[PDB]
Amino acid sequence: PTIVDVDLGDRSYPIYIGSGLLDQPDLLQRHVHGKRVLVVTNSTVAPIYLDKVVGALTNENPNVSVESVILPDGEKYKNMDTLMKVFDKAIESRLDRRCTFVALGGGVIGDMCGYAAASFLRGVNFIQIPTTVMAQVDSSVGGKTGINHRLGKNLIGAFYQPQCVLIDTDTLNTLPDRELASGLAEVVKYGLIRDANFFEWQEKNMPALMARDPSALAYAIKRSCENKAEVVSLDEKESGLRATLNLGHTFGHAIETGFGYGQWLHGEAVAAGMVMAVDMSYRLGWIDESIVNRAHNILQQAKLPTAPPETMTVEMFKSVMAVDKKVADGLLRLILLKGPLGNCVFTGDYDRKALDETLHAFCKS
Amino acid sequence: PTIVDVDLGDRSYPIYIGSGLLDQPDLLQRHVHGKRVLVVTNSTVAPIYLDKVVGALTNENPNVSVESVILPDGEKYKNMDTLMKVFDKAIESRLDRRCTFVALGGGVIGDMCGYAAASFLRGVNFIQIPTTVMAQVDSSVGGKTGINHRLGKNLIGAFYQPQCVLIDTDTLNTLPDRELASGLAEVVKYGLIRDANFFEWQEKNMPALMARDPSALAYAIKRSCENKAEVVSLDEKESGLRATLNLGHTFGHAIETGFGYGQWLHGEAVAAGMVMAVDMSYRLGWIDESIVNRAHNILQQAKLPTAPPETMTVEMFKSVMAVDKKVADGLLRLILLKGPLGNCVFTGDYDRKALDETLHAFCKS
Ligand SMILES: NC(=O)c1ccc[n+]([C@@H]2O[C@H](COP(=O)([O-])OP(=O)(O)OC[C@H]3O[C@@H](n4cnc5c(N)ncnc54)[C@H](O)[C@@H]3O)[C@@H](O)[C@H]2O)c1
Numbered sequence: 164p165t166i167v168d169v170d171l172g173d174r175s176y177p178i179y180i181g182s183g184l185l186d187q188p189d190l191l192q193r194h195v196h197g198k199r200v201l202v203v204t205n206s207t208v209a210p211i212y213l214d215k216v217v218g219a220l221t222n223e224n225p226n227v228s229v230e231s232v233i234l235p236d237g238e239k240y241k242n243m244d245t246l247m248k249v250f251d252k253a254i255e256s257r258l259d260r261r262c263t264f265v266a267l268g269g270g271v272i273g274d275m276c277g278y279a280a281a282s283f284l285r286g287v288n289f290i291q292i293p294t295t296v297m298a299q300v301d302s303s304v305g306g307k308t309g310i311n312h313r314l315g316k317n318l319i320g321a322f323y324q325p326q327c328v329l330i331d332t333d334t335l336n337t338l339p340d341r342e343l344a345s346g347l348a349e350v351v352k353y354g355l356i357r358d359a360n361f362f363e364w365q366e367k368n369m370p371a372l373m374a375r376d377p378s379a380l381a382y383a384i385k386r387s388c389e390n391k392a393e394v395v396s397l398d399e400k401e402s403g404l405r406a407t408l409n410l411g412h413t414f415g416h417a418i419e420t421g422f423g424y425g426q427w428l429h430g431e432a433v434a435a436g437m438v439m440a441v442d443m444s445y446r447l448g449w450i451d452e453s454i455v456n457r458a459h460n461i462l463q464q465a466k467l468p469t470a471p472p473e474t475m476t477v478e479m480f481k482s483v484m485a486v487d488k489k490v491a492d493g494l495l496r497l498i499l500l501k502g503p504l505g506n507c508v509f510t511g512d513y514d515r516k517a518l519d520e521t522l523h524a525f526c527k528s
Numbered sequence: 529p530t531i532v533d534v535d536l537g538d539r540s541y542p543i544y545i546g547s548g549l550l551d552q553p554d555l556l557q558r559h560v561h562g563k564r565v566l567v568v569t570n571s572t573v574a575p576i577y578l579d580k581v582v583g584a585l586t587n588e589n590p591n592v593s594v595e596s597v598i599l600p601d602g603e604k605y606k607n608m609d610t611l612m613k614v615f616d617k618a619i620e621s622r623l624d625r626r627c628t629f630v631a632l633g634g635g636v637i638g639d640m641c642g643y644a645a646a647s648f649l650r651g652v653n654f655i656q657i658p659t660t661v662m663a664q665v666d667s668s669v670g671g672k673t674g675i676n677h678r679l680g681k682n683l684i685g686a687f688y689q690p691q692c693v694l695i696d697t698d699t700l701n702t703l704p705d706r707e708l709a710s711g712l713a714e715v716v717k718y719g720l721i722r723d724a725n726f727f728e729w730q731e732k733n734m735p736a737l738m739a740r741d742p743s744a745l746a747y748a749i750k751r752s753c754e755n756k757a758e759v760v761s762l763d764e765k766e767s768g769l770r771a772t773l774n775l776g777h778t779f780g781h782a783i784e785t786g787f788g789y790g791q792w793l794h795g796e797a798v799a800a801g802m803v804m805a806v807d808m809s810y811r812l813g814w815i816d817e818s819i820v821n822r823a824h825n826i827l828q829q830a831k832l833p834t835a836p837p838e839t840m841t842v843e844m845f846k847s848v849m850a851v852d853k854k855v856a857d858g859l860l861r862l863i864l865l866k867g868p869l870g871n872c873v874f875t876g877d878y879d880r881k882a883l884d885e886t887l888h889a890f891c892k893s
């Protein structure tokens with residue numbers, strides 16, 4: 164069991180990482196400070212891990228009782244109505260401020276569960292058990308929770324930290340290849356924004372990760388968590404630094420909202436968003452040809468898309484980018500690369516013609 | 529302009545109190561930190577105050593553009609579906625993280641706008657402009673925001689603190705006697721929980737408050753906000769001490785949900801429920817009978833109910849109380865009077881016979 168910690172003072176919490184951690188009941192029990200637990204998962208994950216997870220919380224612990232809600236599987240259910248099922252279940256069972264929610268699944272569940280937890284009775288303790296690469300390197304950590312609105316991605320939610328995060332890499336064993344690769348998008352992101360040695364290591368080790376080698380995947384998770392924990396501890400609520408985690412995400416969200424929720428996996432949208440934001444960066448003269456080539460090579464190694472869907476138009480991009488949460492006072496700040504690899508800027512001061520070229524170069528219409 | 533602070537370090541903020549405050553644009557504009565504002569109000573309040581508040585937000589203020597969203601008026605509407613109207617409007621007009629919400633109304637609007645602000649883009653700034661007594665003396669202060677569920681009161685929300693609170697005493701001039709009176713319930717509450725001298729003051733001053741004397745009303749407000757600000761600063765998230773503000777509110781919330789949201793005013797529900805709490809306190813032999821009948825009498829001078837509605841039952845009270853937020857690991861903790869006037873306890877330890885003796889005394893079935 165490795166531990167990357169997130170230090171937010173009295174609200175600090177541990178990220179436990181290893182194999183078979185779902186068979187170490189002591190880990191979860193330590194963060195369940197009440198009698199009752201509500202596991203939140205979806206229809207795909209539930210048959211695989213729920214019994215295991217209730218097992219890990221109860222069968223060797225007699226004073227803990229566990230309930231579940233199984234929500235439908237899909238990014239397209241990341242909405243207020245599907246979230247209302249969690250509040251409905253919790254109130255039907257008469258759960259109270261001492262209960263604990265447990266997010267069992269990918270990033271869709273983590274985000275929904277975290278926000279529900281933030282809001283139920285004005286907040287109850289919750290724990291993350293990510294079961295995707297995406298969630299294990301990104302979504303489970305940091306306490307950004309919430310839902311999509313039809314006009315945009317993550318527009319309603321809460322900053323709300325879990326009590327712990329339990330990553331067991333065995334759970335990746337049941338994850339389809341496509342879901343695996345899409346999680347690596349965010350791993351590459353850490354490399355580009357602030358982690359050149361991490362990036363470098365990925366250029367060498369991407370075949371391992373794609374072959375799902377345990378040691379590789381475990382380090383990519385660990386090192387991703389180190390980055391994300393550092394940033395969150397410094398900038399929990401995104402005054403400045405935290406926005407760096409949004410490289411390729413202004414575009415990537417435009418791909419998700421535009422291309423209709425769910426068709427492309429998030430990581431697939433980020434893959435393509437990142438290429439676009441690399442291209443803009445070059446066009447602005449802020450980065451080298453070499454970064455462009457290496458960004459393009461590594462995502463190709465991960466069999467992720469390096470351009471957006473051919474139905475995405477320039478107008479859809481602009482219209483969805485208009486509700487990006489990096490807008491301040493009607494001004495669109497972007498995350499762009501600048502200088503040697505591992506360097507990035509959070510800025511609203513970029514030549515808009517460069518942005519316009521990038522859109523027109525990547526869009527068929 | 530009388531000020532009363534709320535002390536939460538870097539989240540501290542003033543409550544301004546006085547007449548004609550809506551005629552001092554300076555006060556609102558100080559706390560609007562961006563170019564955009566969305567005034568959330570309702571259809572009763574809008575055509576009386578919206579123009580004026582838009583006028584104050586923009587006078588000598590080119591930098592700021594102001595929009596509004598008009599919600600339906602009623603406790604009935606204090607729920608998630610209606611709140612979607614705030615999000616939908618916000619996103620449609622592309623409001624960003626730097627926008628400010630202005631909650632313009634009674635406590636329904638405050639709680640709703642508060643929780644909408646907490647959640648919009650995971651938190652934007654908001655400001656409180658209470659226009660009912662209930663709001664001016666209680667709900668506007670403390671950053672307890674949220675909404676009802678069918679099965680219970682304020683079971684979804686957040687602890688979110690406003691940028692400031694603008695009590696303009698003139699807004700009470702348009703409020704009906706019934707609404708005004710119902711506000712006085714929380715004024716009394718402060719007396720009984722922690723402020724004996726204030727209580728004694730109200731006993732002299734009740735006829736004055738019911739006649740809308742400017743001085744009495746204003747001092748009630750200041751004293752009511754001082755109490756709450758003191759409690760909120762010490763216990764913002766309700767670890768312990770804050771729960772004391774819920775005297776008679778366990779019973780009260782049960783009346784609201786039991787008898788139908790908005791059939792009685794909150795204040796009216798709270799009055800009856802306070803009277804039940806004192807009865808239970810006496811039955812426990814924790815309280816002298818002078819406190820019982822002193823309470824009964826001040827409420828009657830406010831023309832407030834001292835019984836719950838005739839169709840409330842014992843079962844209804846018990847089933848709604850089971851989802852009170854004062855319940856912890858299945859144990860219902862209550863606010864009860866013990867000792868001289870102005871002293872309180874929050875306890876899980878009481879004889880349950882006292883509890884359903886008081887339930888059977890007040891309910892026809
Ligand atoms: N909150 C944050 O900071 C943050 C960071 C990154 C992403 N996110 C959000 O999280 C989501 C990321 O999506 P995701 O990749 O987690 O997708 P996801 O939650 O949809 O999961 C991917 C798919 O794999 C299935 N699945 C999950 N775990 C499995 C397992 N162990 N075995 C087999 N199948 C499994 C799921 O049912 C789903 O069909 C996005 O909505 C994104 O916006 C949030």
Ligand SMILES: NC(=O)c1ccc[n+]([C@@H]2O[C@H](COP(=O)([O-])OP(=O)(O)OC[C@H]3O[C@@H](n4cnc5c(N)ncnc54)[C@H](O)[C@@H]3O)[C@@H](O)[C@H]2O)c1
Nearest residue numbers: 572601634635636659660662663666667672699702703794
């Ligand atoms: N957040 C807190 O800490 C807190 C504290 C106490 C109460 N509350 C909540 O606040 C609510 C109590 O609301 P309320 O009693 O203010 O009622 P309310 O918000 O429903 O408004 C009272 C009625 O008077 C109308 N009105 C408001 N201002 C007016 C004015 N100036 N002139 C004419 N009419 C006006 C409203 O449109 C409504 O019809 C409850 O839902 C309660 O739970 C919250």
